[PDB]
Symmetry: C2
Subunit: 430 residues, 2 copies
């Protein structure tokens, strides 16, 4: 038998060491503000990543003609297939002899051996990260072809994410890809309630009509939101992927917290809270790995850092974590809440209902009256954090591993190492 | 006997994971520009830090009444004594019962056991990092009292750094502290040549009259510079600290690359080249550790990150490493070279002689004519890197360990862990 019965790749898209540290601090502040920051010590307050037995660093560059910093598509193809590729490539490489060539993925190989397989993400289900594990396209933007390959070709047992619109494209016969999915035995789930109601795999969960699931703060705090949180999707997914039989053939699972990246591109201070949810899910995964009858291998990393986040802004040696701890709505939701409001008292009331701000300045009122999306800069300034870019940055990022052969990650590794480790754990070739 | 005969703490002041990554990339570009960035993989081009058998992450916060981000003094007191303290404290803590109280350091304890001891840095010899290992003061700015304690109290066998001015202060009797040092058997070395000429310890090397040693690019490229590089100071220091006798009692050594921090405060792109020298020295130290008759324990980390460096600026997924590779002089030296030059051709000539820039724009000419120190921003823009702050940032930083019990650092640790590890390695209490 192979070293592990189950293998899980957990990608936090956009996570570098600064996002992780920001969330470590936030966690400590929320736990015991009086003790803070003395309780930030990992000896005092273990976080979800600290539960991983090994950690190292990982280089993230692509094999691109122009860009030195990777996109998600290139990085995920490395995680899934163990090869470097160009930015925007999904599940293949550009060859000098023969144009685009598909490469196999660890998911496909695990499926061929009898492992159950899943993809779970907070982004559109067909976005680049999960797509590289279960589809092959020259351009990551071809999301209806990615959906067609999920349903007609690869057929993962669990697919959980956003954007039902992709699956409303035409199937190769009959109706839409939702129809094709039901033909193959899939239950379709569109809300958290419907997911909990699922009684048997396979499952196609599509929790938004278009675009990504809401950001973590908005899922948690918006009473109208019907989407599951990442912890609930993982819990549902692992139960559906795990069945008596095996015992050497469990499952391969991709889990992605995908919107840390989105918050970075937007320069939204809620990137920290998104990372907080992501780190909690890392802890959940270690807890699961320790409970299993047969061994479980876990590997977790960021695809690249996004936003150039720094824990400090301009000059002072202080960050105001209370601003981030008290924030109950992201800038995306606050833009909607503040739209068309002109009165200072009403602007102040809305801000106060969803953040720790109790008094706005006349200037902050003018900014929000003009453009509610300026609340992101108001909050970043009040927190004392900064972003340098609306793009990705080229830093090496942390990698974490747990389970058999996890100590091979107590090293600097390349991102292609993820695919090699997963393949070794499941005992497959490529 | 204890686990190790020799222990070395190597602090890179201001180093976070982004500085390390920037230098990894720079190294790969200098090695094989045609292959770049594919040769950045740690499987293709090992760097000095990759040679360390274990790595983890380290929290850096102080126990300060106001600041959440550490200064060097607080972090070094943690590294040396295993306790958290306030920003600016050297070798002591503020107690609620009795004001400032000294705490013992690993250096003092190792000395009491018979280990030879040294301090080697590119900063002023009495700057906060080395001071915390060999002095005790309520305020890091009291550099003449730190010098007095080095010479009259702690007496490390090797002291190498900058700023002879501190040692020209009055001794408790007789002349100056240089006189006191010679009274105790020290040879004084003031240039690289004089250091090489030293035949027996103890040695007090002071390579600048005032302030720090020059930045690495300027030491390397300025024909008038008479200062030793860090590799040469370490080589000299290790030979002087190591003698037949023991074999269980070798030496404890603090080594600091201290000016990565300075470049961060200045937002100088030469922070990357300074880090490149620092990573090379990390490799040198591992090479040494592997050669020793008896075991050698090494631990290396940053005290905190400085500057909010990001590998990307504004938007693009590209950094231009050739700009950093071709830079032969820091902004500090270029300010002197360009001072009072008005002619466009002459400005362009000077810039071209010391960088990879071959053509300036009319605008860049205007900036340099106005204020030569603007070359730092010209270079950061041409490289595509960015800084967010002229201060420290609060991110966790990498830690590296090698030798006996190095795998205890394959974990998230607090900065106080450094002192505990060093004490365990040398077999001392506190
Ligand atoms: Cl098996
Ligand atoms: Cl196909
Ligand atoms: Cl259904
Ligand atoms: Cl936000
Ligand atoms: Cl506030
Ligand atoms: Cl590797
Ligand atoms: Cl001993
Ligand atoms: Cl004293
Ligand atoms: Cl002398
Ligand atoms: Cl510079
Ligand atoms: Cl250039
Ligand atoms: Cl610890
Ligand atoms: Mg197996
Ligand atoms: Mg993604
Ligand atoms: Mg089950
Ligand atoms: Mg300042
Ligand atoms: Mg404050
Ligand atoms: Mg010993
Ligand atoms: Mg220092
Ligand atoms: Mg010797
Ligand atoms: Mg952009
Ligand atoms: Mg370029
Ligand atoms: Na490690
Ligand atoms: Zn990404
Ligand atoms: Zn992105
Ligand atoms: Zn420092
Ligand atoms: Zn500093």
């Amino acid at each position: 038998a192979s070293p592990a019965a189950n293998a899980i790749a957990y990608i936090v898209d956009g996570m570098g060491q600064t996002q992780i540290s920001a969330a470590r601090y936030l966690n400590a502040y929320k736990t015991a503000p009086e003790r803070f920051p003395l309780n930030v010590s990992p000896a005092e307050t273990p976080t979800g990543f600290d539960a991983f037995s090994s950690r190292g660093s990982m280089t993230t560059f692509p094999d691109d003609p122009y860009e030195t910093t990777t996109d998600s598509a290139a990085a995920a193809t490395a995680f899934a297939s163990g090869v470097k590729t160009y930015n925007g490539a999904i599940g293949g490489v550009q060859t000098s002899g023969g144009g685009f060539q598909r490469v196999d993925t660890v998911l496909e190989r695990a499926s061929a051996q009898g492992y159950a397989t899943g993809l779970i993400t907070t982004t559109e289900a067909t976005h680049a990260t999960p797509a590289a594990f279960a589809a092959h396209v020259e351009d990551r933007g071809n999301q209806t072809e990615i959906a067609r390959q999920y349903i007609e070709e690869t057929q993962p047992d669990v697919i959980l994410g956003g954007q039902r619109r992709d699956f409303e494209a035409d199937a190769s016969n009959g109706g839409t890809l939702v129809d094709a999915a039901r033909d193959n035995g899939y239950t379709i789930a569109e809300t958290a309630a419907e997911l909990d109601a699922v009684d048997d795999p396979p499952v196609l969960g599509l929790f938004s009509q278009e675009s990504h699931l809401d950001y973590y703060l908005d899922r948690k705090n918006d009473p109208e939101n019907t989407q599951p949180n990442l912890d609930a999707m993982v819990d549902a997914g692992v139960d559906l992927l795990s069945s008596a039989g095996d015992p050497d053939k469990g499952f391969f699972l991709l889990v992605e917290s995908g919107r840390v990246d989105h918050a970075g591109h937007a320069n939204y201070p809620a990137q920290v809270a998104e990372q907080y949810e992501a780190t909690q899910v890392a802890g959940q995964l270690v807890e699961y790995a320790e409970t299993t009858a047969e061994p479980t291998f876990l590997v977790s990393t960021g695809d690249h850092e996004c936003g150039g986040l720094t824990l400090g802004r301009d000059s002072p040696y202080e960050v105001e974590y209370d601003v981030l701890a008290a924030q109950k709505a992201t800038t995306s939701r606050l833009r909607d809440l503040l739209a068309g409001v002109r009165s200072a008292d009403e602007l102040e009331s809305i801000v106060a209902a969803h953040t720790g701000i109790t008094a706005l300045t006349d200037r902050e009122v003018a900014k929000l009256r003009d453009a509610p999306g300026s609340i992101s800069t108001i909050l970043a300034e009040r927190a004392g954090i900064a972003f340098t870019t609306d793009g990705h940055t080229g830093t090496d990022v942390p990698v974490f591993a747990h389970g058999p052969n996890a100590a091979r990650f107590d090293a600097a590794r390349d991102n292609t190492a993820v695919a090699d480790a997963l393949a070794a754990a499941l005992g497959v070739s490529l």
